[PDB]
Every structure is written in C-alpha cells, then in structure tokens.
Amino acid sequence: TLFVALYDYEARTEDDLSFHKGEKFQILNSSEGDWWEARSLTTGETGYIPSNYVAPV
C-alpha cells in the first residue's frame, strides 16, 4: 500500500517529514495514531506524515 502526497508540506520539526505533491511513502507504522511514521520511496528518509495530506493508491 503506497501513499501519495496530494499537497506539499514542509516539516516544522525533525519529527515530521517534508514532502511535495506526488511524493510516495512507505507506511511503516500506521498504528501509531493519527500521524504515521513512513519512509519516503524517493528520498528514503523517515518521519511522521500527516494522513490528511496523503492518499492511498
């Protein structure tokens, strides 16, 4: 299950991850709560991503 970013968002900390429209993330832990920690398929970095800005493909 890959998630694509609908809108771009710049991280405000090192907890959240910055991404752009069209970004593909590999959901690592979706059971963390509202914000899920995922690993980008493009950069390969880890961080929390807002579920409202992404959509499942």
Binding site: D15, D16, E32, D34, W35, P50
Partner: protein, 64 residues
C-alpha cells in the same frame, strides 16, 4: 492560552495549545501532535467543518 478539543482516532480529548509541537491544516481537516507532561504524547485531529472556527483560528496562525 486555550485548550483545544480533538478526536484522537475516536478518543475525544482536550489538550492545551501550549503543548502542541506542530500543526498541519489541510483546509478540510487539521492534524497536529501534542506532548503531554504526564509522560504520554499523542496526536489530534480537528475537523474544520465540525468544530468551532474560534479554536481553528488558534491552531493555524500566520507563518506557522
């Protein structure tokens, strides 16, 4: 300042805005994370349609 109410994956809770780290508004739903001093952090989601705009104006401010 104020205590924001949210529904953490269904868990209705109210946490002080002063305990929030970052706020990400989508224009439909606001998602954020809070750090409680009681040794228990979490996340919070507030609907921009099913919640008072007064509190929404406190979540996402100019140059957030």
């Amino acid at each position: 300042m104020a205590t924001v109410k949210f529904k953490y994956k269904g868990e209705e809770k109210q946490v002080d805005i002063s305990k929030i780290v970052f706020v990400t508004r989508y224009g439909k739903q606001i998602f954020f994370r809070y750090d409680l001093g009681g040794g228990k952090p979490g996340f919070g989601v507030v609907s921009e349609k099913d919640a008072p705009k007064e509190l929404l104006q406190k979540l996402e401010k100019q140059k957030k």
